[PDB]
Amino acid sequence: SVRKRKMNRSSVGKATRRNKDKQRKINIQSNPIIAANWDYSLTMAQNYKKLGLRAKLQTPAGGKETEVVKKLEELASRSQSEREEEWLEKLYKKHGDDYKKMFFDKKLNIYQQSEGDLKRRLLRWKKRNG
Amino acid sequence: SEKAGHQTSAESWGTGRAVARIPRVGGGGTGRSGQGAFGNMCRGGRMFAPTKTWRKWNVKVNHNEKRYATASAIAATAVASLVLARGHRVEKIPEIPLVVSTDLESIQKTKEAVAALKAVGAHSDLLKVLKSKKLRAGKGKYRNRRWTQRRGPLVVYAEDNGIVKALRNVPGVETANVASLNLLQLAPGAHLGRFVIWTEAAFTKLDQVWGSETVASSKVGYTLPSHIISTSDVTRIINSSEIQSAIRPAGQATQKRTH
Amino acid sequence: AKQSLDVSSDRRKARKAYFTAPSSQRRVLLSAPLSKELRAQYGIKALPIRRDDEVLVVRGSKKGQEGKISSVYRLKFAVQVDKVTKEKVNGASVPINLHPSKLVITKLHLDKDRKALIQRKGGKL
Amino acid sequence: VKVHFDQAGKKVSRRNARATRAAKIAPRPLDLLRPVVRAPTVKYNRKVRAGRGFTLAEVKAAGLTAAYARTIGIAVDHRRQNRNQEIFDANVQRLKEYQSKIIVFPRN
RNA sequence: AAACUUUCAACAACGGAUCUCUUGGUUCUCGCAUCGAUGAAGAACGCAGCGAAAUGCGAUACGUAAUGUGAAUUGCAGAAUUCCGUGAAUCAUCGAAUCUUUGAACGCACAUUGCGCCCCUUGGUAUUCCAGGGGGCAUGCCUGUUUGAGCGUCAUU
RNA sequence: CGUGGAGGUCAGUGACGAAGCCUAGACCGUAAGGUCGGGUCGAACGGCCUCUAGUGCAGAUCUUGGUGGUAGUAGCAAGCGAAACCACAGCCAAGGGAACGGGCUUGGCAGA
RNA sequence: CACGGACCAAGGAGUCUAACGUCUAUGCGAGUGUUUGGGUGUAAAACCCAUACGCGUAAUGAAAGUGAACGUAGGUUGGGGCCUCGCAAGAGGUGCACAAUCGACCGAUCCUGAGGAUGGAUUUGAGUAAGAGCAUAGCUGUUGGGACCCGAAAGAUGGUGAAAACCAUCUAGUAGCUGGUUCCUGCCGAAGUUUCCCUCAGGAUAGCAGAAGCUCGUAUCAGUUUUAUGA
RNA sequence: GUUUGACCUCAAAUCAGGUAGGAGUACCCGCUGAACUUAAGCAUAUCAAUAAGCGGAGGAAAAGAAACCAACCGGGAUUGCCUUAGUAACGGCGAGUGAAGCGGCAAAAGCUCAAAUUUGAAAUCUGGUACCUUCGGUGCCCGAGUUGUAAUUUGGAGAGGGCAACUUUGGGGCCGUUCCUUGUCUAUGUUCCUUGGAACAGGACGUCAUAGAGGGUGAGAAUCCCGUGUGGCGAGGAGUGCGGUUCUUUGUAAAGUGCCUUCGAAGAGUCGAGUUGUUUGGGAAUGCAGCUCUAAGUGGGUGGUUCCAUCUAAAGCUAAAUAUUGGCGAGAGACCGAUAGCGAACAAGUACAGUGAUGGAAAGAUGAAAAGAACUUUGAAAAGAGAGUGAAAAAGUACGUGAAAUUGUUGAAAGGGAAGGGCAUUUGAUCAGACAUGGUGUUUUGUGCCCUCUGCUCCUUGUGGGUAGGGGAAUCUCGCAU
């Protein structure tokens, strides 16, 4: 070759890259419980059977719980705004619990929300307050 | 190369020029001008039948025939005379086929692993190798085939516990998992009967791997092949009580010269 | 046996790498062993070689002769030991090109980075 | 004239590709849960094969939603139709079994 | 008989076969995506104490700075270096520099090392002018910006 | 039978001289060739059971390289110095069936 | 006659592949074929395998169909072998493959016409007799690939030069041909041509020389003589 | 208002910010397009939806989420492989050309516009400028933009509300893991003897091995050096993949799900039609282009025997599986070994030749180290002679081995107008030609593995083996020595 002949001849050197070992021994990255329980001497499919978890959901072409309990372990384990709360205080002190009067009201209930909207927000308000 | 020999701009000089009709290079004042190209006989010319990539390199074999061969190769490892003929200094080994205890697999260090074989009796076979290290006799020296040595024992294990690494430095010693068992390892150079050190667990597993009368096979729809004879020796049949009873009397093995 | 896929067991690649090695790599390639006395003191097998240190020649025609290194000829992969000299026909003196694998160091030349080099390799000065 | 010299090479390529996908998609099974489908044409109708994707109908009958189905790794097809009754039953049972097996990790 | 011619043998010549080697080639496989108006690929002129190609480099010119290594370079000559350290080296790395004349080649030009213009300007009082230093002025097109032009359209108590 | 390389084997041979090269040297094989002595050499090589192929030369007005006769000739408009060409040699008579006599047959003859 | 040979060294020519066969070997066998792939691996090796597919396993036809036992899957005759007798020589029985003869089943015929029933007329068949294939390898043939090696008059594409050209590729262009084709020994061993395709060209065949399988090993014949019986 | 002011359009500038060209080109995407050659001459078939030329891209490209295939107990983006298959089909049925659906597998991922109003508030963006934690954020100003920029929707529908006493919830640092680049540490003889210049060889004696790949070192080195093998300690970067660690989360905010209620628009000089060419093996001109005319909305496209099935064109995006004689960087070989292998292992696309496009070689090896021959001497120079270095110059910068042709010298032989060859022999020259030495039968003695006394030890069947201490030849040839 023309260009390769110069690169071998020059005193610049070549951008030598040794990256063939890393193409096989790939570290697991996305789960810490797996990161501890993964034998790199074994293959992909062999590591899955060792754990318990399925490696393939289809019937595979060709031929052929210590860890899974720890995954079930990690499976065992919103408020309202200041204006919204203060606005609900105005409605409750005015009417009480008359939602029909509350939604036919114009001065306090400006955005013409339904009975179901106002009462739901009042239930959340009655949890944080009286 | 596809280009080699075609990287010239030669032209045939024509008829009646009092010179051979081989296509000669044009130009002038170079030395290469007025000389032969495009010809197998010519210097710097293109070779006859340029070797192409699409030659049949790999060989398709019947899977059953291939299995037959490995079974034959295994069978020949347990003969002792066949092993001695093949090479392998197996005079001072306790029995054939040689089976060592399963604790051989667990050995981590090469020093301890070679001490196991030396205690068994493969000492002489491991001295056959190491003393047989010679330079390659060809152009193989400068094609990464510099050294050549004799084949030592195979060490067959059921499952590894550091044995593959323990023996991968002691020269000649090859290991194989029983599930595999390579033909190229079992019969090197198409000569039967390598000296095979089996392990206890491997030897028991060999029943499962191939099969017998009682056990199944573990290979799908495979059975071990039947003998077309009953006995591998003829002379028990011929020198029987039976055959020698239904037979006419004997000659001298060499005729007395009549006239 | 080779296990890594990164390293090459090719003869052609290896001989080229050696003969077209730079001066810095040739410093490491020209390493000498230490004598049994220094190995007992410092707790180290071998070091790269320099100028102002003493040496004893083990193998060759100049067997058993000793001296002090004049100049490390890294280009020719050689050392030139002073007082290990071949006398020319004109009365002049020409140093023999020895190789540092054949030499053995008897008395090191300890500098600051040399002390650090010993301490790195598991030494005890 | 092409020759496939790289049959051994590309199997090692494909295996290492699956190995990377295993490393990056750590707990998950590399591929999506595909349906079970009856093949077309008189010749092949006896054969029952892996289909492309389920349906909105099969997903809805299983007890989950279409957009959510894809996030849990169920392949969903929208052009496929549920004409057959036996195929519909087999796929619904396949999903419900799959839903008993799955363990969807929290987002905290 | 000698000489001469021829044959054989021995010793010289001539030639570079054979053998052996090999920092080269060829083929297969694997991985990665990385040129250019911030001026590339290419051409030319040069540059080292002493150089042909090659390699490196651009008036900072077989280099400068930076980082690491730790004491050479060596074909020859000659300098060095405080060598318990900001440090030898045609060392490695390479991110900061300079980067001649050209070349898509880009101020105007044809094949003129000519023909200029503007800005910044240190010097020769420099108010005249003279010289030096430094950066720009190609084409097309997009987003703007701006001074306009247009009986192109409308408004106008 | 032989050559380049591959697997196997001979715990083969080998700086006390491998391979190669010669040799008015010896032995074996009908032969292809194989083995040995002597001389020269300086680093690898061979037999055996198998594998594989760019494997064996007298020719192609063969390709490449080298070296002759021609010739110290033609020549330069005592020295310098080719080329064309080249199976091999060049006495006559007679016979050699076949528009074939230059090698044969029978004679004449023939001195460097 | 003519073409080749001054001499010497080295180089130098039936190769590789695909398609389709031949025979032999090996594996298994009504099946057979792992190697597109997946799993695994001491890593292009080796070792495992899912679902399919390839080819074969049950035929007779033209649009529409039907379907193989009167059966020791036949009656006879032979027929390698085997059994009884005989010292043998022979005789008798059972008879494989195979061959000859008589037929049948199935489909298809010539009719009879209850849409084609029914009975007769006969033959027909890579038909059934009651499966032999598939795959690998070796030997080799046929055809295409540059195709044993070298050698011809060319066109086209794109470019360079110039008071009709050259360069580079297509192009290793195509040959109804010329020259050359590389080790030894043993054994067998021709032909010089029949007849039409018309021949001219290339062949289609028979003859001469083999290869293998099958019956026999004989009374199978002979470039011959003799007797017998004709023009 | 005979001023002036909105716009639209055309300008401008050495303004501000950008960007396009060229090289490379193996692969890919377009455009253009021969001839030698095959069937018999050549218009198709055929070379060939080739080569050259032209334009354009990338790490891949292209293709792609159906206006699809089907006729089934339906499949379901695209790409590739296996197979379908040398089948259907076409071809003066001939040179032959040559698919596709299904099936197995590789890899799998989907979505964004245009479409009916944010109209109770252009909710959007560019740019300038000022700061900030700078691949950007924020304030302010400017412009674009209603000839429509944001949010909401893309048929899988969707939206408007209502009911669930429904369900879910951002973002920024910090230290780790991970990825990239780079540095550094990690076993064991230079132990004896022989030979050689030299030990890396032979022999004896040992160690290490997750290291006996490879390379160097004065010849074949696991153990001399570098590495190799298994591990460890780092430095500088990348980064949203997640682990932890926190700092802040807000607004009547952003969705999701089921039920009930009211609506509910989907691409035109395009589809199609005739014709002239191109494309194919395409039989239902397939595909495309040119030219003429040019639609519909309980629509339209495509297929199956009178209906039925199947999608929704005329807009767009998208990884992976796939290609790769280039580039960048590796790892290899039943490859070639200097007339081979690339043209080039070396001052090689160099020397050189051609006006020019272009054509284009030859040429590797001294030794371990130059120790490259000092110094005397022969000659103006060219080369020699003594002498020396080295293991060897019987290795000399004409340099490893040094073949044949061919040339000289010397020696031997032969030669009256041919030699070389075969059978046989003489003469001349010359080379082979035992470190061969006993064999047998008796006789002195002297020893031992012999007789005899006492034992010890390995194992398998009697028909064992190894190995000590004493004695004794007057019996014994049992062996070996004289």
From Swiss-Prot, chain A:
Biased composition (Basic residues): 1-8, 15-25
Keyword field: Nucleus, Phosphoprotein, Ribonucleoprotein, Ribosome biogenesis, rRNA processing
InterPro entries recorded: Ribosome_biogenesis_Nop16 (IPR019002)
Main location (coarse class): nucleus
Keyword Coiled coil: no
UniProt KW Protein biosynthesis keyword: no
One protein family per Pfam: Nop16
GO annotation, cellular component aspect: nucleolus; nucleus; preribosome, large subunit precursor
Modified residues annotated as Phosphoserine in this record: 79, 81
Region (Disordered): 1-28
A GO BP annotation: ribosomal large subunit biogenesis
Location(s), subcellular: Nucleus, Nucleolus
Record note on quaternary structure: Component of the pre-66S ribosomal particle. Interacts with NOP7, RRP1 and RRP15.
Other information: Present with 2860 molecules/cell in log phase SD medium.
Function of the molecule: Involved in the biogenesis of the 60S ribosomal subunit.
Family: Belongs to the NOP16 family.
Protein name according to UniProt: Nucleolar protein 16
Gene source species: Saccharomyces cerevisiae (strain ATCC 204508 / S288c) (Baker's yeast)
Taxon lineage: Eukaryota, Fungi, Dikarya, Ascomycota, Saccharomycotina
Gene this protein is translated from: NOP16
From Swiss-Prot, chain B:
GO CC terms of this entry: cytosol; cytosolic large ribosomal subunit; nucleus
Keyword rRNA-binding: no
Subcellular location, principal: cytoplasm
PTM entry text: N-terminally acetylated by acetyltransferase NatA.
Keyword Nucleus belongs to the record: yes
GO BP terms: cytoplasmic translation
Sorted UniProt keywords: Acetylation, Cytoplasm, Methylation, Nucleus, Ribonucleoprotein, Ribosomal protein, RNA-binding
Resulting phenotype, residue 46 to E: Leads to a slower growth at higher temperatures but allows RPL4 assembly into the 60S subunit
Signal peptide residue numbers: none
Gene Ontology molecular function: RNA binding; structural constituent of ribosome
Location relative to the cell: Cytoplasm; Nucleus
Entry-annotated residues carrying Omega-N-methylarginine: 43
Misc remark: There are 2 genes for uL4 in yeast.
Family, similarity comment: Belongs to the universal ribosomal protein uL4 family.
Role: Component of the ribosome, a large ribonucleoprotein complex responsible for the synthesis of proteins in the cell. The small ribosomal subunit (SSU) binds messenger RNAs (mRNAs) and translates the encoded message by selecting cognate aminoacyl-transfer RNA (tRNA) molecules. The large subunit (LSU) contains the ribosomal catalytic site termed the peptidyl transferase center (PTC), which catalyzes the formation of peptide bonds, thereby polymerizing the amino acids delivered by tRNAs into a polypeptide chain.
This protein's domain notes: The eukaryote-specific C-terminal extension harbors a nuclear import signal and delivers the ACL4-uL4/RPL4 complex to the pre-ribosome, triggering uL4 release from ACL4 and incorporation into the 60S ribosomal subunit.
UniProtKB/Swiss-Prot annotation, chain C:
Chief localisation class: cytoplasm
One example of a Gene Ontology biological process annotation: ribosomal large subunit biogenesis
InterPro entries assigned to the protein according to its UniProt record, in alphabetical order: KOW (IPR005824), Rib_uL2_dom2 (IPR014722), Ribosomal_uL24_CS (IPR005825), Ribosomal_uL24_euk/arc (IPR005756), Ribosomal_uL24_KOW (IPR041988), Translation_prot_SH3-like_sf (IPR008991)
Keyword Aminoacyl-tRNA synthetase: no
CDD domains registered for this protein in UniProt: KOW_RPL26
Keywords of the record: Cytoplasm, Ribonucleoprotein, Ribosomal protein
Localization of this protein: Cytoplasm
This protein's GO CC annotations: cytosol; cytosolic large ribosomal subunit
An annotated Gene Ontology molecular function: structural constituent of ribosome
SUPFAM superfamilies noted in UniProt: Translation proteins SH3-like domain
Pfam families in the record: KOW, Ribosomal_L26
Cysteines joined through disulfide linkages: none
Role, per record: Component of the ribosome, a large ribonucleoprotein complex responsible for the synthesis of proteins in the cell. The small ribosomal subunit (SSU) binds messenger RNAs (mRNAs) and translates the encoded message by selecting cognate aminoacyl-transfer RNA (tRNA) molecules. The large subunit (LSU) contains the ribosomal catalytic site termed the peptidyl transferase center (PTC), which catalyzes the formation of peptide bonds, thereby polymerizing the amino acids delivered by tRNAs into a polypeptide chain.
Protein family membership: Belongs to the universal ribosomal protein uL24 family.
Miscellaneous comment text of the record: There are 2 genes for uL24 in yeast.
PANTHER family: 60S RIBOSOMAL PROTEIN L26 FAMILY MEMBER
Name of the protein: Large ribosomal subunit protein uL24A
Origin species: Saccharomyces cerevisiae (strain ATCC 204508 / S288c) (Baker's yeast)
From Swiss-Prot, chain D:
Entry keyword annotation includes Transmembrane helix: no
Annotated keywords: Cytoplasm, Phosphoprotein, Ribonucleoprotein, Ribosomal protein
Major localization class: cytoplasm
Annotated GO MF terms: RNA binding; structural constituent of ribosome
GO biological process: cytoplasmic translation
Protein localization: Cytoplasm
Domain of life: Eukaryota
GO terms under cellular component: cytosol; cytosolic large ribosomal subunit
Function of the protein: Component of the ribosome, a large ribonucleoprotein complex responsible for the synthesis of proteins in the cell. The small ribosomal subunit (SSU) binds messenger RNAs (mRNAs) and translates the encoded message by selecting cognate aminoacyl-transfer RNA (tRNA) molecules. The large subunit (LSU) contains the ribosomal catalytic site termed the peptidyl transferase center (PTC), which catalyzes the formation of peptide bonds, thereby polymerizing the amino acids delivered by tRNAs into a polypeptide chain.
Miscellaneous notes: Present with 133000 molecules/cell in log phase SD medium.
Assembly information from the UniProt record: Component of the large ribosomal subunit (LSU). Mature yeast ribosomes consist of a small (40S) and a large (60S) subunit. The 40S small subunit contains 1 molecule of ribosomal RNA (18S rRNA) and 33 different proteins (encoded by 57 genes). The large 60S subunit contains 3 rRNA molecules (25S, 5.8S and 5S rRNA) and 46 different proteins (encoded by 81 genes).
Entry similarity comment: Belongs to the eukaryotic ribosomal protein eL13 family.
Annotated protein name in UniProt: Large ribosomal subunit protein eL13A
The gene coding this protein: RPL13A
